């Protein structure tokens, strides 16, 4: 009924550009012509495609395949660890992270990643240690911020937005999810924020984007408070935009999968 | 408030094995080609199923390509000419249907929605007729049926509907959607209905893709754009891939975003 009102995108549809570089990448896979250094290559790259798409087992399948080829595939290991936290293996989710920092203790984004499935696993303290070391990599990505509030929150809510607000402080406040800072640190109401929402999109592809990852926040607000009904609705919505290779899409999943359990 | 949504559908692990162990057998030279024709066009149906509809029609046009008695082939291939907005070939398709296979009567409800996606109503008319005529408990007939005739003559199209929905068992789930449409119940109790009636994420993903197309269409007939453009939206946010609710709900937001 209410869901009529709702700021909504159409949801984000194979492109045809997609769909033809899967068409060549069978093809080529298929050939005779490819070195193993080619081939681990190619098969990483459509993963990454079949991930994008969705299809996060073709990507697994592809990725391992990678891996068997050429073991030095901290990217492989990385997609390896989210797939597990998506799974709620969070202890063999650190093992693959811990497997990336150790093949390249620069990829980054294995700091966000275990953060996020220490996260879930319930160990806040080490989560904002790694949330912590990847926003300091990058203080300006409010994204950044969110997660290390998300972490803080359940021990000290108090602290974790006195903090927050002090990251939003000191960054330059320019990229967009900054105003999902301003929403949980109560400056701006709800409706402000889809406004602003509305007003930064400019095709249905940057709407998609911007629901995926606003739902998921405001889910994630609607659930500490213990509004379960809205939070199911905001993390349904996240989902419904399609935005597959998205941390707030993978997870607004996960915490799905978590509300249907109880 | 949350149950009014599903969580959209995902890609079963079962539908990922069967693609990879699917290219794996199309990269072997153990196909004779009628084996080759029907694996791609089974592979072809389940893309398709996925929302990978450019990768299906190429698995289909090399099935046909083989073996072009392929009814089932063209019948895909004009749904996409539809969905494509290329109605004029889309009624083509269709034709090659039902020449190869006169019984291929899914090819009439296809025909049918093209023609009225063309414009051509009393053509759709006839092709959407013969359809319901061949299961008149299937309201989603009667419901396309309906759709086709209002343009011309609401009252006359409203009488038929009236008519289709008492001569009817009133059973499947959509003759709710006729109820709605025929003024005897609200969009609330329609949707307290399906809420009711669905049993699990799946089907109520599949209940929110019919009806919420069938709300945005009457929605849009009274003018009402900006309900119906979230209807469509909310039609497709289940990903029923394969739905005619899904494909046409796309379809009615890509003329609505054209404008």
């Known amino acids: 009924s209410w869901r009529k009102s709702e700021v909504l995108a159409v949801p984000l549809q194979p492109t045809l550009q997609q769909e033809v570089i899967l068409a060549r990448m069978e093809q080529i896979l298929a050939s005779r012509a490819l070195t193993d250094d080619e081939r681990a ?21 592809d990725f391992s395949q990678a891996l068997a080829i050429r073991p030095d595939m901290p990217e492989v290991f990385n997609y390896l660890g989210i797939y597990l936290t998506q799974a709620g293996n969070f202890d063999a989710a650190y093992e693959a992270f ?31 240690d790694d949330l912590l070391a990847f926003y300091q990599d990058d203080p300006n990505d409010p994204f950044r911020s969110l997660w290390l509030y998300l972490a803080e929150q359940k021990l ?7 903090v927050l607000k002090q990251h939003f402080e000191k960054s330059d406040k320019e990229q967009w999810g900054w105003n999902i800072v301003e929403f949980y640190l109560g400056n701006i109401s709800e409706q402000t924020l889809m406004e602003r929402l509305k007003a930064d999109a400019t095709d249905n592809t940057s709407l998609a984007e911007h629901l995926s990852e606003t739902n998921f926040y405001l889910g994630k607000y609607y659930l500490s408070l213990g509004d379960l009904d809205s939070a199911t609705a905001l993390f349904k919505l996240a989902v419904a935009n399609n935005v597959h290779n998205f941390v707030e899409h993978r997870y607004a999943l996960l915490e799905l999968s978590l509300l249907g359990q109880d």
Do not use: C, F, M, W
């Not at 991930?51 to 087992?57: N, Q, T, V």
């Not at 966000?112 to 806040?124: M, S, V």
């Not at 000290?156 to 006195?162: I, N």
């Open 41 to 61: 290559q190619l098969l990483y790259e459509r993963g990454v495609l079949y991930d994008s798409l969705g299809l996060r087992a073709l990507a697994r399948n």
């Open 98 to 128: 811990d497997s990336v920092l150790e093949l390249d203790p620069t990829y980054n984004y294995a700091h966000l990643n275990r953060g996020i499935a220490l996260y879930y696993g319930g160990r806040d303290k080490l989560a904002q």
């Open 156 to 162: 000290d809510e108090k602290q974790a937005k006195e």
